[PDB]
Amino acid sequence: TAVDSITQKKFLCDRTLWRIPFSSNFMSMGALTDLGQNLLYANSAHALDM
Amino acid sequence: KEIPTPYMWSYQPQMGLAAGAAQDYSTRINYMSAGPHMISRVNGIRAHRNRILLEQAAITTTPRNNLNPRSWPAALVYQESPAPTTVVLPRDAQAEVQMTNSGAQLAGRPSFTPRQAILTLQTSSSEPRSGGIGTLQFIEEFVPSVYFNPFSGPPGHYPDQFIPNFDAVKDSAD
Amino acid sequence: HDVTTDRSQRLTLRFIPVDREDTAYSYKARFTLAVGDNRVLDMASTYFDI
C-alpha cells in the first residue's frame, strides 16, 4: 500500500548537559580559558542581554 | 594642557596587572573655587602634588623596562621568606622500637632514651610568584609616570600603555 | 597569545556546484572548491550532503 504520509524527525538529550567552552579556539583547555584571560575582558563593568 | 592632568594606578588581585590609568575626577578640583588673585594658587600648588607625584613615581617605585609590563619577575617585589620552623621530635622513635617488640606497651622527652635528632624542614617556597603581585605592595610598584603632553610623537609605540586591553605584542586587539 | 585570531575567519561552511550531470546510474558533482588564503583545511571533517 501507498498512502500519502511524511516523515517526522526528532532527537532526545537525557542525562547529558549542554556545554560551550569560553575559548576563542572553542576548547576546554583549563581554568583560565582563552577568552577569559583575554585583553578587553576582566577590566570593566558592563550590561548583559541574552 | 599646561596644567598636568594627574593619573595613578589601582590594583587587581586576580592577575597582578594595572586595571587602568585615567585622568581622574576621583580627586580633581572644585572648579572656579578660588579667588582672582588667589587663583594662581591652583595653577601653582595643585600642580605641586603633580610635581611631588613625579617625586613619588621614583621614590620606591623601582623603574620598569616597559612602562606597563605583562608578567612580573621576583626581584624587589617583596617575596616573603618566613624561616623554617625547626622542632626536633614529640616522641622518640629509637626508644619505642626496643620495648614494644620485646615486651611493654606504651601510650605517651620519653621514658627511656632522650636524644636530639633533627632534619631540615624548609618552609619558604621553592620558586617565588611568576603570576603577579603580592596583594598590597602597589605603591611600591605603580606610581603614575605622568606625561603632561596628551599625545607626543608619531603613532607606533609612542608614550602609550594607558589602556588595559593595550598589549605590547598586538597594536590593537579584541 | 599565539593560538587564536581576533579578525574575520570562517568555520563550518557550505559549497555548492553550478553544473551537474543527471543520468540513469551516474551523478557527477563538480564543485569548484578553492580553499581560502592563510588557512589549512583538515580532511577527516570535510563531507558531502544529499
Side-chain angles (χ1 to χ4, degrees):
Chain A
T1 182
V3 161
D4 276 333
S5 314
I6 310 149
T7 299
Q8 195 186 301
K9 287 176 178 179
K10 281 272 182 178
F11 83 99
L12 244 204
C13 252
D14 327 52
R15 204 135 209 180
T16 164
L17 279 151
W18 185 65
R19 211 168 193 178
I20 174 163
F22 201 70
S23 298
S24 46
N25 290 297
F26 314 100
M27 293 270 83
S28 298
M29 296 148 80
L32 48 144
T33 51
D34 205 291
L35 280 160
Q37 58 165 130
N38 217 298
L39 286 159
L40 221 158
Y41 302 87
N43 287 299
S44 188
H46 302 271
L48 280 153
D49 276 72
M50 283 162 74
Chain B
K1 184 186 151 61
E2 286 91 312
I3 318 295
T5 55
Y7 298 88
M8 221 294 175
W9 320 83
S10 243
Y11 173 70
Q12 298 296 72
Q14 50 190 289
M15 286 185 78
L17 286 160
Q23 288 157 74
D24 41 62
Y25 199 79
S26 26
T27 328
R28 211 189 179 97
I29 297 298
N30 34 91
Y31 268 106
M32 300 190 70
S33 286
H37 278 259
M38 226 131 140
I39 211 151
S40 292
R41 192 98 100 165
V42 277
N43 288 302
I45 63 147
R46 165 213 176 188
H48 188 86
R49 225 214 68 259
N50 147 72
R51 283 166 91 254
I52 77 147
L53 199 78
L54 201 144
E55 293 186 321
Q56 208 154 105
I59 196 86
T60 337
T61 304
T62 317
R64 51 202 94 94
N65 301 52
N66 299 298
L67 287 153
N68 187 251
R70 41 179 180 180
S71 186
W72 282 81
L76 215 73
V77 287
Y78 257 91
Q79 293 298 319
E80 197 75 60
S81 184
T85 317
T86 320
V87 284
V88 192
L89 289 163
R91 292 175 193 174
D92 279 329
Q94 288 158 50
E96 279 173 52
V97 174
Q98 203 177 58
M99 272 74 257
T100 53
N101 296 325
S102 188
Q105 280 185 287
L106 293 150
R109 201 171 172 182
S111 299
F112 278 86
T113 318
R115 202 192 167 269
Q116 53 271 109
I118 342 99
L119 274 86
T120 321
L121 329 159
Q122 280 206 302
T123 298
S124 303
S125 59
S126 302
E127 277 175 58
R129 289 184 193 181
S130 186
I133 300 170
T135 324
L136 293 153
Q137 53 200 35
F138 210 63
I139 282 171
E140 213 187 298
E141 295 159 325
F142 279 87
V143 196
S145 183
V146 281
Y147 215 90
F148 77 104
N149 291 16
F151 177 68
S152 187
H157 63 285
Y158 57 90
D160 211 304
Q161 298 149 299
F162 288 94
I163 325 142
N165 57 65
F166 206 96
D167 211 305
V169 282
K170 298 171 196 76
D171 276 298
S172 302
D174 177 58
Chain C
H1 320 281
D2 64 297
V3 202
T4 187
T5 186
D6 294 303
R7 283 181 177 180
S8 181
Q9 274 283 77
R10 67 165 259 182
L11 156 74
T12 322
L13 190 134
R14 183 182 177 179
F15 210 98
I16 312 148
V18 73
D19 191 63
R20 55 195 182 181
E21 290 181 304
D22 206 321
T23 341
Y25 62 92
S26 59
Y27 205 98
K28 282 185 179 180
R30 208 169 290 165
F31 312 90
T32 334
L33 182 90
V35 55
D37 298 62
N38 297 300
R39 181 200 158 202
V40 288
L41 213 182
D42 301 65
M43 290 145 94
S45 199
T46 316
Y47 300 116
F48 305 92
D49 201 282
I50 300 166

Coordinates of all heavy atoms in Angstrom, one line a residue, chain A residues 24-26 34 37-38, chain C residues 1 3-6 11:
Chain A
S24 N 38.1 31.2 22.5 CA 38.1 31.7 21.1 C 38.5 30.6 20.1 O 38.1 30.6 18.9 CB 38.9 33.0 20.9 OG 40.1 32.9 21.5
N25 N 39.2 29.6 20.6 CA 39.5 28.4 19.9 C 38.5 27.3 20.1 O 38.6 26.2 19.6 CB 41.0 27.9 20.2 CG 42.1 28.8 19.7 OD1 42.2 28.9 18.4 ND2 42.8 29.3 20.5
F26 N 37.5 27.6 21.0 CA 36.4 26.8 21.4 C 36.8 25.4 22.0 O 36.2 24.4 21.7 CB 35.4 26.6 20.2 CG 35.0 27.8 19.5 CD1 35.6 28.2 18.3 CD2 34.1 28.7 20.0 CE1 35.3 29.3 17.6 CE2 33.8 29.9 19.3 CZ 34.4 30.2 18.1
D34 N 40.7 30.7 27.0 CA 41.2 31.7 26.1 C 40.6 33.0 26.1 O 41.3 34.1 26.0 CB 41.2 31.1 24.7 CG 42.2 31.7 23.7 OD1 42.1 32.9 23.4 OD2 43.2 31.0 23.4
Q37 N 41.0 35.1 29.9 CA 42.3 35.8 30.2 C 42.7 36.8 29.1 O 43.8 37.4 29.1 CB 43.4 34.7 30.4 CG 43.6 33.8 29.2 CD 44.9 33.0 29.3 OE1 45.0 31.8 29.2 NE2 46.0 33.7 29.5
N38 N 41.8 37.1 28.2 CA 42.0 38.0 27.0 C 42.0 39.5 27.5 O 41.7 39.8 28.6 CB 41.0 37.7 25.9 CG 41.6 37.9 24.5 OD1 42.0 39.0 24.1 ND2 41.6 36.8 23.8
Chain C
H1 N 47.8 33.8 23.4 CA 48.8 34.8 22.9 C 49.2 34.5 21.4 O 49.4 35.5 20.7 CB 50.0 34.9 23.8 CG 49.7 34.9 25.3 ND1 49.2 36.0 25.9 CD2 49.8 33.8 26.2 CE1 49.0 35.6 27.2 NE2 49.3 34.4 27.4
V3 N 47.7 31.4 19.7 CA 46.9 30.3 19.3 C 45.6 30.8 18.6 O 45.1 30.1 17.7 CB 46.4 29.4 20.5 CG1 46.0 28.0 20.0 CG2 47.6 29.3 21.5
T4 N 45.1 32.0 18.9 CA 43.8 32.5 18.4 C 43.9 33.7 17.5 O 44.9 34.5 17.6 CB 42.8 32.7 19.6 OG1 41.6 33.1 19.0 CG2 43.3 33.8 20.5
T5 N 42.9 33.9 16.6 CA 42.8 35.1 15.8 C 41.7 36.0 16.4 O 40.8 35.6 17.1 CB 42.4 34.7 14.3 OG1 42.4 35.9 13.6 CG2 41.1 34.0 14.2
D6 N 41.8 37.3 16.1 CA 40.9 38.3 16.6 C 40.3 39.1 15.4 O 39.8 40.2 15.5 CB 41.5 39.3 17.6 CG 41.9 38.5 18.9 OD1 41.0 37.9 19.5 OD2 43.1 38.6 19.3
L11 N 34.1 29.2 9.9 CA 34.0 27.9 10.4 C 32.7 27.2 9.9 O 31.7 27.9 9.7 CB 34.3 27.9 12.0 CG 33.8 26.8 13.0 CD1 34.7 25.5 12.8 CD2 33.9 27.3 14.4

